[PDB]
Amino acid sequence: LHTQVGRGLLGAVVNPLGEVTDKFAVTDNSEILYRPVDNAPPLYSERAAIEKPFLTGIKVIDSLLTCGEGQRMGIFASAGCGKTFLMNMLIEHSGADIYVIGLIGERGREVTETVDYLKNSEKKSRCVLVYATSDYSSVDRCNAAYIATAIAEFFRTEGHKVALFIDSLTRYARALRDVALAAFDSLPRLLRRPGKLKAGGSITAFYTVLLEDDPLAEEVRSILDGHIYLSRNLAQKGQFPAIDSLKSISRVFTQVVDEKHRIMAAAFRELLSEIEELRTIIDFGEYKPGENASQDKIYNKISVVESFLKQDYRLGFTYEQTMELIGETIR
């Protein structure tokens, strides 16, 4: 019911009991205080309006799915669609003050992969990892999500721009459903706790949701402020990040970017729609070059559009670089 918080947890690996079992980085700060893990979300008049963008360094996200400070964003994918690689890029190329990762329901080797990744990370000195392996009970797995949230909430009250990752909301939902055997709706209460405080910092949250052969993922689609969809089709095609920008949305998009940006984004999204229409025409074998000038114009832009959407996972792009690239693509 209470947990460790503080700068002394930066670089530490926290188990579902709130104890430090490993370290991926050592910090000079030893600040350790204790806060309740269950805490009420901020009432609406303490919450600020999401106005400032949360830059991620990922081109398609920063251009067409621009995240905001205090926003809650879902990552819908079917493992393995590169959900872990996408969150690695989100931690690498964003500019948050502090990163809090919560690995819920991972089987056991998976957690060691991320701790090894944090050991060689640029952001190692600003990360806190909370984990709950598949061997822990369901009670411990739900406490993992709330320990991670409470750790992020303390940094937000200190004024820090925090980024919280919950992987995954689905295995967290299984654990809550399993706990329900003891004689369902703690999920929304958690998913409200992020946000930007008028009197403090912010928590920008990323929740992963595992898809494939969910009925209630449509309601968690209804509670968040946008969702990023990783298409198994595009991953097999060889395009990473395999984000389907046409099936993704950031509901705060028009509030966090200027009009210059809105016009460029709208033009790119229709260019993508025309590209997909031409893909259906090509697969039908009814496309012959020189027959239709508009189809030839769109065809010759397929390559530059694919080049803009792709991104080396070791590379990050500033906002100016992103808008410059998408501008040349629309020309």
Curated annotation (Swiss-Prot):
It is an enzyme of class 7 (translocase). Changing residue 212 to A: Slight decrease in ATPase activity. GO terms for cellular component: cytoplasm; type III protein secretion system complex. Its EC number is 7.4.2.8. Changing residue 106 to A: Lack of ATPase activity. Mutant is unable to form external MxiH/SctF needles and to restore the invasion phenotype in a knockout strain. Changing residue 109 to E: Abolishes oligomerization. Lack of ATPase activity. Exhibits moderate invasion and hemolysis levels. Low levels of secreted IpaC. GO terms for molecular function: ATP binding; ATP hydrolysis activity; identical protein binding; protein-exporting ATPase activity; proton-transporting ATP synthase activity, rotational mechanism. It is found in: Cytoplasm. Oligomerization increases ATPase activity. Monomeric forms exhibit low-level ATPase activity by forming short-lived oligomers with active site contributions from at least two protomers. In contrast, oligomers exhibit enhanced ATP hydrolysis rates that likely result from multiple preformed active sites within the oligomeric complex. Oligomerization is important for both enzyme activation and T3SS function. One of its GO terms (biological process) is protein secretion by the type III secretion system. Disruption phenotype: Mutant is defective for assembly of the needle and secretion of the translocon proteins IpaB/SctE and IpaC/SctB. Amount of the needle filament protein MxiH/SctF is greatly reduced. T3SS effector protein secretion is reduced in Shigella strains coexpressing wild-type and inactive Spa47/SctN. Changing residue 81 to V: No change in ATPase activity. Changing residue 210 to D/A/I: Lacks ATPase activity. Keywords: ATP-binding, Cytoplasm, Nucleotide-binding, Plasmid, Protein transport, Translocase, Transport, Virulence. ATP binds at residues 80-85. Changing residue 251 to A: Lack of ATPase activity. Mutant is unable to form external MxiH/SctF needles and to restore the invasion phenotype in a knockout strain. It comes from the Bacteria. ATPase component of the type III secretion system (T3SS), also called injectisome, which is used to inject bacterial effector proteins into eukaryotic host cells. Acts as a molecular motor to provide the energy that is required for the export of proteins. Required for type III secretion apparatus (T3SA) formation, proper protein secretion, host cell invasion and virulence. May play a critical role in T3SS substrate recognition, disassembly of the effector/chaperone complex and unfolding of the effector in an ATP-dependent manner prior to secretion. The N-terminal domain is required for oligomerization and ATPase activity. The six N-terminal residues are necessary for proper oligomer formation, though their absence does not entirely preclude oligomerization. The extreme N-terminus is also required for interaction with MxiN/SctL. The N-terminal domain, not ATPase activity, is responsible for localization of Spa47/SctN to the injectisome. The binding of ATP induces a conformational change of a highly conserved luminal loop, facilitating ATP hydrolysis. Belongs to the ATPase alpha/beta chains family. T3SS ATPase subfamily. The core secretion machinery of the T3SS is composed of approximately 20 different proteins, including cytoplasmic components, a base, an export apparatus and a needle. This subunit is part of the cytosolic complex. Forms homohexamers. Interacts directly with MxiN/SctL (stator protein) and Spa13/SctO (stalk protein). Can form a soluble complex with Spa33/SctQ, MxiN/SctL and MxiK/SctK. This is Type 3 secretion system ATPase. It comes from Shigella flexneri. The chain holds residues 83 to 430 of 430 of the full protein.
